[PDB]
């Protein structure tokens, strides 16, 4: 009837598309630097 | 005379619906007919009366139902490659 639609539209990952239409996985790491306190990084030695 | 038109020309030679030098409030026309397969890709105005541009390159077809899925920027398909292909910058209204 009006412009209703459904807003979420199924995409067609089909195998025989084009590099550019072949569904990529992505993923993304998001961090702040500036809190004082930190819980994680990589390992180094200690010293005195 | 465009929009609502009893009879077009061939779907692959499109008319040249140069829409310049006015207001392209074409929205109204949405409640004259039951617009369905409704995808602006670009810009989806549900009214459009401000910008001026100098190119539109409109265009009008005569399609089924189950094909619109060849209907989007950069896609392949029966249209794409037989009829028109759309860019991968396609930024329009397909209106059928």
């Not at chain 2, 995808?39 to 459009?48: F, H, I, Q």
């Not at chain 2, 009366?49 to 950069?74: H, M, R, W």
């Amino acid at each position: 009837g009006p412009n209703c639609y459904f807003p979420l539209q199924s995409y067609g990952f089909r195998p025989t598309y084009g590099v550019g239409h072949q569904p990529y996985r992505v993923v993304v790491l998001s961090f702040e630097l500036l809190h004082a306190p930190a819980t994680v990084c990589g390992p180094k030695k200690s010293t005195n | 005379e465009v929009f609502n038109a009893t009879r077009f020309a061939s779907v692959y030679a499109w008319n040249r619906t140069r829409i310049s030098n006015c207001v392209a409030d074409y929205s109204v026309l949405y409640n004259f007919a039951p617009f369905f397969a409704f995808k602006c890709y670009g810009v989806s105005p549900t009214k459009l009366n401000d910008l001026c541009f100098t190119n539109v390159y409109a265009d009008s077809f005569v399609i089924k139902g189950n094909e619109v899925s060849q209907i989007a920027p950069g896609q392949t398909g029966n249209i794409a490659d037989y009829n028109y292909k759309l860019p991968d910058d396609f930024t329009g209204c397909v209106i059928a």
